[PDB]
Structure formats: C-alpha cells, structure tokens
Amino acid sequence: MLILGLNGNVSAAGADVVPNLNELYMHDAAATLVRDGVLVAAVEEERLNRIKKTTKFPSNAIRECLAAAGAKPADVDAIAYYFPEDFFDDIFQQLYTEHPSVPTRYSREMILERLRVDLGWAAPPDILHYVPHHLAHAMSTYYRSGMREALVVVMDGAGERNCTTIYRSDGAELFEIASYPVPKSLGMFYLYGTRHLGYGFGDEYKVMGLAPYGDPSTYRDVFSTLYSLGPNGTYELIPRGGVVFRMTTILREHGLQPRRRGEPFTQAHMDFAASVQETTEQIAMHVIGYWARSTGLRNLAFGGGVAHNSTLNGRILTSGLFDEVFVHPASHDAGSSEGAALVVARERGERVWPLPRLTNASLGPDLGDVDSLERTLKSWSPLVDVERPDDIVEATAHLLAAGEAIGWAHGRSEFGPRALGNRSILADARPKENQTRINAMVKKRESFRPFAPVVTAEAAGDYFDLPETVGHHDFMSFVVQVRADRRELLGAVTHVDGSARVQVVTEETNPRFHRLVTRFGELTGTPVLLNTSFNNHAEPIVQSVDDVLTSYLTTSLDVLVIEDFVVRRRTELPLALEDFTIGFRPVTRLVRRLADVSAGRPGAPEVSHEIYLDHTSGPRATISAAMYELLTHADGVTPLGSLGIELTGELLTELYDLWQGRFVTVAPV
Amino acid sequence: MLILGLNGNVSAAGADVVPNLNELYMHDAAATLVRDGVLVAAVEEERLNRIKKTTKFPSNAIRECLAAAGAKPADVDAIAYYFPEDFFDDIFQQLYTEHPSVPTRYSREMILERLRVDLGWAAPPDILHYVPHHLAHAMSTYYRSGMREALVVVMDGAGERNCTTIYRSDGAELFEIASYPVPKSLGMFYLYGTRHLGYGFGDEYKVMGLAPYGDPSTYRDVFSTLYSLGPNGTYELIPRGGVVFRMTTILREHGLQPRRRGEPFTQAHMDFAASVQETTEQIAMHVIGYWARSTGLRNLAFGGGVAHNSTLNGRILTSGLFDEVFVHPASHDAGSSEGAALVVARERGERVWPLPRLTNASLGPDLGDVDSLERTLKSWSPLVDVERPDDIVEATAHLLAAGEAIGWAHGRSEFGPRALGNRSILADARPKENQTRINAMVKKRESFRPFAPVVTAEAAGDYFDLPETVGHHDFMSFVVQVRADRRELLGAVTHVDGSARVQVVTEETNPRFHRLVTRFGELTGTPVLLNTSFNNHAEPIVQSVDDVLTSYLTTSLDVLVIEDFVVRRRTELPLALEDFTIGFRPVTRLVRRLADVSAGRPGAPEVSHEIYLDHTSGPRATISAAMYELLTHADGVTPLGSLGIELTGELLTELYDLWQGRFVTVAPV
Ligand SMILES: [Fe+3]
Ligand SMILES: [Fe+3]
C-alpha cells in the first residue's frame, strides 16, 4: 500500500490563505511517502520553497517525493493528514470570523484544490483521511524505532487536545495511558523563553546552545513560581494566554526585559537560558521518570518537537531508566505526517509491523546523475573552476586536513533539521578557533553557538563517553560527554561543560560520508569532523545544485565538494554575472513606494525603492533606483549582459547583497 | 485645576508602534480637558486623523481641545491616562517579546515623547498619572449624571481586571461592591456575535439594528449552552480564548457558518442577531436587577461600552427598577479619559462635587467664525453655489419640508458616536422610503439599517411613549416605543417592532437645532426629523469645513447647510478640479509593485498600481498607470490644472472614486 502523508497549512506559493497567517498554524510543512510501511521518500517544503519552517502547502514536496520514489500520483492509495478534520475546520472557521471577506471553504476542499492546481492531480474527496496529532507522532516514533515493546512519549507544543501523551506499546498497537492538557505545554514554555531572549519560532535550539554558559541558580527562585512538580508524575505550569501572559508580568516585576534582536548576550541572558533549559528538564524527567517506573518499560521511543531538545535527550540516557532509547530525525510536525500515513494504512487493512529500525534520514531528492551535473557545472564556469579527482573521498580528506572549510553535498537530502553528511558544511574538529571562523565568518551568526562532531561507529568509544543506555546516535539526537582526555584535542566541537551533540555514523547509513571520516582520521590521527548544516543565515538547508552553488558562492566557504567534483570560486566575490539571469521567487515583491513623511501641512511625497519576501517574518531591503530599474527586467531568462544596462562594480555589489539575502534567484542561462 | 485626560495607544501619525497593531489595543483614542470639574473640551482622534475608532495617540485631539478651551500647554496641571501604568507596560512587554527588533520603551517615556514630537510640548515625567480603567469609567458616568446618589454600573469589553464593576455612590466618592472577571465580558461576547455576522470591531450597533427583524427562539437552545444565570446576580459565560474559541466549535457543530462581508442577510442571520441581543439583555438585566434590588438605589448611572446598547438601555427604563437613569454620550473608552482626569484632580486635592448634569455633547472644535467661512466657501466656488439667506433656520426648514435630504454642520462637533445636530444628515421623518434613500443611495450601506428621530422636548410626549422611569434622552442613549397612533406617520424612523432610538432636544442644549425642529413642525405639523451621522462609508463623522465640503460633494446629498450658508453642487459630479490640489494623508501609500505571478519556471514580472491606507483594516484600491503618474504630483500645493497632464473625464472620474474612498485629500488652492 502506498500512502502520502502531509502536514502544513493550505497556502499557495504566491500568497497565504490569510494575510500574515500565524507561523504557529501548521509550520514545517512536509510530505512523506510510505510504501508497505517503509519510508521511501520524505522532504520538508522549506527545502523547496526556500522559506524556513514554512506553513505553505507542501506541493513541491509531494512532486519530489513521488519522483524520488519512482511513483506517479495515480499509484497513491490514500492521503493522510496529521490533524483531525474537525479541529482543522474549527481553526478555519475561527480565521473566517476574523477575516469577513475570505470565503468559507473547509480543509478537505482546500487541500484537494491545491493538489489540482499545483500538481494537476485531481482525486475523489474521499482519498483524504485525517488522524489524531499525538497518535500520528507516536506511530512514527514507535514504528521507526523497530522496538518490539516500548514506552512511547510524545511531548510537543500542541495537538488538538494534549501537549503530552504517554502510550505503552502492544505489539503493532499503542495503548494511551495518560495525557497532559495543552496549557501545560513544555514546547510553548520553551518558545516563550526563546522569545524573551530576543529570538522567534524555530530558534529554540539556539537557547539550548546558550544554556551551558549560564548558571541556573541566578533565577531559580523566580522560576519556581512558574511551575511545580506534584505526586505521581503530575505538574503545574503557569497558564499561558490572555491580554498579558502571567509569565510576562512576573518577568517584568523582577526587572527582566526581553533582549532585542542583534544585541550582545550578557551573563544574565545566559542564566535565563539555563533556567529555561533546567525547568524543561525538571518537568520532562518528572513525567518520563514516573511513567518509566510505573510501566517497568526499559525501551523508550520519544517524539514530538520537545524531542529535538538533545540536552534533554542526554539526560534521559544518563538517568539509567532505560536500556535503549530511539528518537526520530524528524520528531517535529514534518515527521508526524508519516505517522498519519501509518495509521491510515492500518485502518485500511495493511499489517506491516514490526519494521527495521530507521538508520538513514537521507530521504529527500538527490542531485541527479553525475553526467547532467558535469554539464550544469560547465554553465557555472564564469564563476568557478571545476576539477574531478580520481577519488573524491581522498581529495576531500586532504582538503579538510590542510585546514579548508568545505561545503559537502551528495545523494539525497536529510529529512529533519540536522545535516548528517548529505548537505553539510565540514571542517577539522580539532582547532578551537573553528567556532569563531565557521560562525562569525562563514555562516554569519552568534559566536557562542557550539558545533557538533561526527565520528565513525568504529571510533566513537575513543572520543566520547557513551552511556550504558544505548541511544541511537545516527541523527545527532543526543548530547554526550567528550572524554576528558580528548576535550583539549576536540577544540571546535566540545561545549564549555565538556558535552557535544554527537553524530555516530555507520558505513550502512552513509558509506561515502563514513569513508570520508575514516580517511580523515587515517591522515590526521583523529576520525572526527565538525558537521554543521549547509545554509547561510537567510535560508534553510540547501537542496538542489542551484541551491548548493548559490550558497557556496554567497558565503565565504573555502571550497565546495559536490558529488565527484571539487569547485572553487575564481574571484573573491561572484561579480561576473554577464551570462547569468535574475528571477523572482513566488514571494518576491519589488516596489516603488511613495509617502508624505513631512510634519505640518502635506508636501511633495518621497520615493523609496524596496524588495521584500512576502511571507510571515519575511526580510526586506532598501534598494537604489538603479537596482529597481535592473530588477524590473528580472525575467529569469534574459542574460544580464544584454539588458543594455551598464554592469558597474557598484550595481553588481548591490546585486550580490540581494542574492546573499535570497531576495532574487541568480542562475546561469 | 486644569487636567488633560487621554486614552489610546502611543502610535505616531505615519506608522504604528508595531506593524498592524491590534485594533483592540486602546481604540477610540481621544483627549478631554476638565477645568474645575467641568468638561470644557472633548474630541476623538478619529475626527481629526479621519481613521474610524483609531488607536493612534491623540496628538491632534490635544491640540484642538487646548485651542477650543482657550488654554495653552503650560496651563495644564496634570495629564491623566485611562489605564494603570503597570498594565500598559505589561502589554508593551508582551508586544516586545513578539517583536524582537522594536526597542523596549515603556508607556510614560513613550507618551511624553509623542507630546514633545507632535506638539513641541515637553514636561517633567511626573506630570503623567494613571488610573484604574473601571474607576475612570465610573467617575465619568457618575459625575456627569449630576446625581446626589446612584448605583453606578460599568459594563465593557475589558479593564485591567474586570469586565463589569458595580459601585454605590457615597457623595463625591464611589464604593466598589462587586465585579465580574474579564472572561465574563458582555462586550467581548457581543463582538464575537458581530464577527460571526460578517462584521468587525465597531460594528456592534449594526447587529443591534438588525436584531428586531429576527426571532430569538430559533437558536435559543444553542445559545443556552453559551451562558447561565445563577443565584444572587451571578452568571457563567462560555470562556473566550484559545486556538479555537469554544463558541466557534459550538456554532460550526450546529451548521452555522459566518456571513461574508457584503453578502445578503438571511432570516437565519437576523435570528442570530436576535439571539446575541437577547442573551446580552438576559445577563445584563440579571446583574443590574440583582444589584438594584440589593442596594435599594433607584438612580442608575450606566457606563462602559455596553452602555452604547440603546436597546438594553430601553429595557432598563421599562423594568421599573429605577426612577432616573443617566448614560454619558461617550460611555466608550474616549469618555473614560475624563474620568481619569476627575480621579487625578481629586487625588491632587480638588473638590468639585457635585456638578450639574451634562446636557450638551457638543465639545469638539467649531467651524471657525462666519467671516473666515464665507472666504473659504468662495475658494470652493468652482464646485458649489453659495447663498446666504436672511434666516438660515427658516430656509432649512423649507428645504426639509420640500423633501430635500441635507448635510447640516454647525458649532462644536459631537463627542461620542452619535450625531446630535452639529454634524448631522437630516431629512423628513415621515416618508418610509427615506430609509432606502438615505441608506442605499446617500450613505451607501445596508438597507435594513433603522434611522433615529429627533423631537423637541415640548413635543416628545405627542410622538413617543416615554416610560415612567426618567431617562436622559439628550444623546440618543435609549430606545422607546413610538406611539401606536404615530407609527404610520413616522415612517422613516420607526423600527419593525414600533421602537426608535430617540433624541429629545432641548433649547438649552442646542438652540439652533431646537429651533430648526420647532420650525419644521410648524411648517408640516410634525416636529420630528430623521437625524443620522454626517459621514460616508469611508470616514468617521466629518469635523472641519474641508471634511464637510468633501463629504457633501462626494455623496449624493441634495444640499449642504453649513452655519449661515446654503451650498449646492453645480454639477452632478465634482469634476472641475483645475484649481484644486491633491495631497497624501499621513497613512497614504502609493505603490508600483512587481511580482511574478506565473506558475512553472519564473518569467517576466507584472506591474500593478495601487493606493492604500496604512492603518489596521485600511482600504486599498487598484489604480491605473495614469492615476499613479498623476498622484506622484500630489504635493497638496500645486493646482491640478498646471501639471501639464490632460484632465480627461476618465482620469477625473477615477480621481473622484479615490476622493470618495478618502485615499487622498482634495482641496482648493
Ligand atoms: Fe506536533
Ligand atoms: Fe472601557
């Protein structure tokens, strides 16, 4: 049976269902394809529409999943949606009361319309089926664990009814044993803390990264008025919601004002981070500990968005409550779509359980074959030199050992937030100064951010203190201690408390990446690399050849390795664009705006030129009259060189700024 | 002692404190000036910035109040704000967590900055004082009643703590005896109902207008699951707030979807309106009845926004619980600003109580003197003919009796939502077809809307069944029955149940308007007129000469009476604008926008031209390339005739559309 699982809102490519549709309303849109129980293809819409954690309907994800799996629309037996229909339709109705001119169409109709318009794919209404949100999460987590018995815990932001649901397995089935209502959400608590630290939706892992620098005791007393642990795994949490969240009143009362975007981080900020992280662990371990003791289960499969807290995951491993713990690479909403697919297949009669443990998150589209790639690379030759060594792994280990920081792109893209050796930025794990270098210089972000190591399965025990409890480390789900005698050596990837978010790579999972790490260690003595996501500040992980080339050229990475090829910039900045086109993204908007900005009596209006990305939280940039004129010609087909506009260094430098911001698409003819 | 009272948010003229600042966040911004306890000047910011129920800081209102009262900034002893400081600062902090780049400035600083920037008025921080929201409401309502003892009830949307507060007077002081928390808000319930009917914030009185057409029994069973009345004046109301309001789930469950803007009203819609109104009355009378019986008080002073429900007010009169009832012309937040002023004066030592009953809501700016007006009118002569009869009241009664519908503007503008004979549209109350005519034709709105009569104090008992309980009818606060033997006669102002929102005008309140109504009755036999607000669909009540002339000329009113002058259009449409200027409002935005709207590979972007008003819920209009070009010259100074652009009928008709929409300011040189 072939099932398509979906999550996300219903918005088209170009405009949203409502103006500035809340970013909480079905974020991390994705599609999964499940064939006889096996996840055969999976990718998040963000990788394709280039909008971080997008809520847009995942049309592109569907197209690519089908092609990646060698399936056609007609092969799909059913479509599974990650939330119940009456809940989703309740949300739409709410929206419609707030926006009187938006037509009252419900989710079923709207989903099918998207399939029809974007994919030319019409189906009978009853192809669509809907599933409880927590069950979707839980089925995904449990089935992908391969475990024959497990305590299965889902902790997130919010389902239709609960923030947290506890299940025990019963062979192929799940028995729900407990839940905690939406107001007790750890996900929502962590997000509030993240917003207080001057961040937004999606930035939770940054707070988790800052927390080790802080002292949880500075604000312990204040935090103790925000929650309590009760008997038998019960807890209370300060009730979110209202004109003013009660938490806001309390913080302001104690003299804590929220950090602004781009301000430095004080010790006070780090302390607050530590308090948010500590509080989250206290409650999560209170719940998990109680239910582990009560059920006597020693296998845990943990999911929902809170399972992306790898520090918490580490605490789970060291508690000694379990013998084995599994966390899915996509424990956020994108992963629950495949859980919906599993539920729907089961309801339809399919019996696939049990399945092998998921070991490989590389389920997105690949880069095409190497022949077509070589051809594409020739089209980029005004900007880059291309070489094809006898052995790409051999060449790459040498690049790494000589001290180069590289883009590394091959095979199918990683499903879930973590790069794992298919769309990675790589460098030596040893030099401590690589933290500043990859951050401040290459990615352009905050310096405090820690980096994650990858080690081979063969060498893991030589660098890390792996706990007695067996975690599955294929997806960087867990924090572990670096061996004390290796902390100095592993300068770029050891946090201030001696910890690291570790990727333990096996040959089976990723032979090329495993061989790379193996060879690097033969050359240097140390089979460990730094592995961070391949993206600048303005984009999600790169997906296509176009994305990879753009990202390489608009950051200051030393060199790009894509499939069999080594690619290096020919100049410092990619300014020779004569034979390149400029195009708009669906969300690009270019304006000449007039406004009378004087005080007193009205006077002559002033002209501004501006480009912006018309999605929730979309960036914006002032541009010159000359840039405006140029971009009126951004048709995605005409070469820049033959627009009869003089391509000055000034104009091209301005264009480069916009390319770096991803406001436009720059590609060869 | 001279106190300035303020309400509203802190936004500048041109942009809001945050993007798309919620319209609930301090709406109906206003300023009041209280001198030795007497309201000497009062006006809402909306009348000046031309934005309905604006949340913008009331800079213009302050300027005009000062000038209207013959005061300078330096004369003001203190500034009073209608909410507590810690509540307002809590709201800002909330906002700042949601918007990381907005600087964390608190209300005191931000208010004083507005005074400094907009008015050139600097003061020491401690000039500003803040007051509990319900006490502000209650002091305003009670003091303006002139009552020596009263039950004082405040029912609104939300204060900092309660939706409803009950007080009994103690001479000049108020003793709080009871409150109901914010989740029990009648104001919020009524707004939700209003949104379900395809309306928005501010439209509550439209729902109240529709309710008599409906049958409250159709949905009685459904509605009974939304609330209950308990012992001793207690009640429960369905808890608002959450992902989905529980009320939304219930409505959708029973097959009730929200009406879209501009759709026709079915019997089902009218029934729903009747249910919302009935429910509101059931609860309000449950609370008021209990407290009237418990306190034994037979004088009621009723305030807060729910006191603008004139149907409810009528039910209060007929209950027989009271001997006298007073409702302020501005019972919404604009009126509470003067309550804050009264509290602050009392705290500072002033003892003004008791004061005479408020009888006159005409406290805004006047139209200047008649000499300057005659001069201004000459400047409009390309568009209008101006005549100056010996006796304006005599001429006007004749216009009315001959069947003309008129604009009528004189003296100081009305404070609060109701026009009362200073900025009114007037017509014969007798012809039933005037309902369709003033609505569908002149104002451009829904046909169902009822119209309100004005009668003289001398004649009130001849047309209306005034209840035994004495209501103060100076401000159209109460609904009463039209005498059965006059319902047929008073065709334009009698609702389907025989009721009307009546204005009983005295000579003292408005001598000119009283004389007009008196003379009209001498001419026709019937001293009753239709009296509706002077505004089209796209604006609040007209304020200035410019506003009045614009409104007259951009609607299809027959004739304008302004002060001593009769003004008539020279052509059907005001197209001779050669000697007129065009200007932007502070919120006007004119754009040439590009976007690639194709599907498939990117292609050439498309150009759109558009003008919009950059405030929350601001209108927007597509315009032609030719209109765009023209408006680039809208400097508010250069005459249209000498721009060297050909003023075709087509272009001028398009301009007229925009003028009617208030997207631009059109005025003589
Ligand atoms: Fe989820
Ligand atoms: Fe209020």
From Swiss-Prot, chains A, B:
Q: What Pfam families has UniProt attached to this entry?
A: Carbam_trans_C, Carbam_trans_N
Q: Which reaction does it catalyse?
A: descarbamoylnovobiocin + carbamoyl phosphate = novobiocin + phosphate
EC assignment: 2.1.3.12
Protein family membership: Belongs to the NodU/CmcH family.
> What name does UniProt use for this protein?
Decarbamoylnovobiocin carbamoyltransferase
Q: Which GO terms describe its biological process?
A: novobiocin biosynthetic process
User: Which EC class heads this enzyme's classification?
Assistant: transferase
Q: In which pathway does it act?
A: Antibiotic biosynthesis; novobiocin biosynthesis
Domain of life from the UniProt record? Bacteria
User: Could you tell me which species this protein originates from?
Assistant: Streptomyces niveus
Q: Does the keyword Transferase apply?
A: yes
